[PDB]
Amino acid sequence: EYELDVEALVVILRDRNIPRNPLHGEVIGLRLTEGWWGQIERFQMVRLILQNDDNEPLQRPRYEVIQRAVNPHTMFMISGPLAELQLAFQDLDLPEGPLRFGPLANGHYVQGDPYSSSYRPVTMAETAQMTRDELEDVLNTQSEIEIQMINLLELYEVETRALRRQLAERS
Amino acid sequence: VEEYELDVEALVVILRDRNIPRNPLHGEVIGLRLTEGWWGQIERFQMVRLILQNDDNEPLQRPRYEVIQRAVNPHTMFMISGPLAELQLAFQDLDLPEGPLRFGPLANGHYVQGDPYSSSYRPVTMAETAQMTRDELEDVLNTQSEIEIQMINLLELYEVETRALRRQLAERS
């Protein structure tokens, strides 16, 4: 649990033409368009803590990291650079292992899908920061991704060959 | 500096099976393409050096071989491809090299469109990652990430080319 600046959060909401007031217990899916890891999208999931067990507003509100990957259907979503989002979510960082991939957290790479299109592997800055088990999980997941990319590359070659043949036959 | 047993007669059968008539010499280094093994039916690479004699140029009753910590290259001169089980007949306890060395020509992430080694490349399997040290994992992941960056770039290029070709077709109805 880290510190939450709710007035910064509201500015972030308004800048994005989101009118809803953030509520206690709400979960938010974050798309971080860039950060310390580089200029590539990553994902994080947080839960607002605005009140205490007695249902009274906190003087110093907080948020917590949720250990589930952000999904394409994730309802409440915010995109922005790490530096901007940290205005609301103090110390915000990437989640463990392949969770940071969001919709690709389980290696499902889909042709034509915007998220698959935007996916980018972990950088060297990221891997220096990982534990052994994180590295295994990330590596396992990127490997699954590569297997689909490879399969897609083969299909592209066959199709490209066929198209070129069709084009000669019709020229 | 670990050395392992070598069955030269078995090596020579391996060679004859492949129409290679040369006899193995002390100090020769061999590039191995393991077509399949305990990691699965995908190709991996390993490099070894024959030890047939002692420091006094006398033939060993028990020849050995050692692993060379360098990646097999496409130009590697003396090459042998076979499944691990077969190659283990000659090289006792043959196993994959450390981290991305096992990719041979791709050990440094150089993924090239149309290149046969690039086309045959396959990422590490879960059987492989479970065995690896942290630093191995890091190196391998860093390498595979460079590969995917090249694959991503290539996918884009296919999609553009595909588009183009389909238009030219369409306009020929």
Swiss-Prot record, chain A:
| Effect after changing residue 9 to S | Complete loss of capsid egress from transfected cells
- What are the boundaries of the region Involved in viral assembly and export? 29-52
Q: How is it modified after translation?
A: Specific enzymatic cleavages in vivo by viral protease yield mature proteins. The protease is not cleaved off from Pol. Since cleavage efficiency is not optimal for all sites, intermediary molecules are expressed.
Top-level taxon in the UniProt lineage: Viruses
Result when mutating residue 42 to A = Complete loss of capsid egress from transfected cells
Tell me what the record says results from residue 9 to A. Answer: No effect on capsid export. Reduced virus titer
Reported impact of residue 48 to A: Complete loss of capsid egress from transfected cells
Q: Which cysteines are joined by disulfide bonds?
A: none
- What else does the entry mention about this protein? Foamy viruses are distinct from other retroviruses in many respects. Their protease is active as an uncleaved Pro-Pol protein. Mature particles do not include the usual processed retroviral structural protein (MA, CA and NC), but instead contain two large Gag proteins. Their functional nucleic acid appears to be either RNA or dsDNA (up to 20% of extracellular particles), because they probably proceed either to an early (before integration) or late reverse transcription (after assembly). Foamy viruses have the ability to retrotranspose intracellularly with high efficiency.
Domain notes from UniProt: Gag protein contains 3 glycine-arginine motifs (GR-boxes) necessary for RNA packaging, the first of which has nucleic acid binding properties in vitro. Late-budding 'domains' (L domains) are short sequence motifs essential for viral particle budding. They recruit proteins of the host ESCRT machinery (Endosomal Sorting Complex Required for Transport) or ESCRT-associated proteins. Nucleocapsid protein p14 contains one L domain: a PTAP/PSAP motif, which interacts with the UEV domain of TSG101.
What is the protein's known function?
Answer: Involved in capsid formation and genome binding. Shortly after infection, interaction between incoming particle-associated Gag proteins and host dynein allows centrosomal targeting of the viral genome (associated to Gag), prior to nucleus translocation and integration into host genome.
What is the name attached to this protein's record? Answer: Gag polyprotein
Q: Which part of the entire protein is covered?
A: 9 to 179 of 648
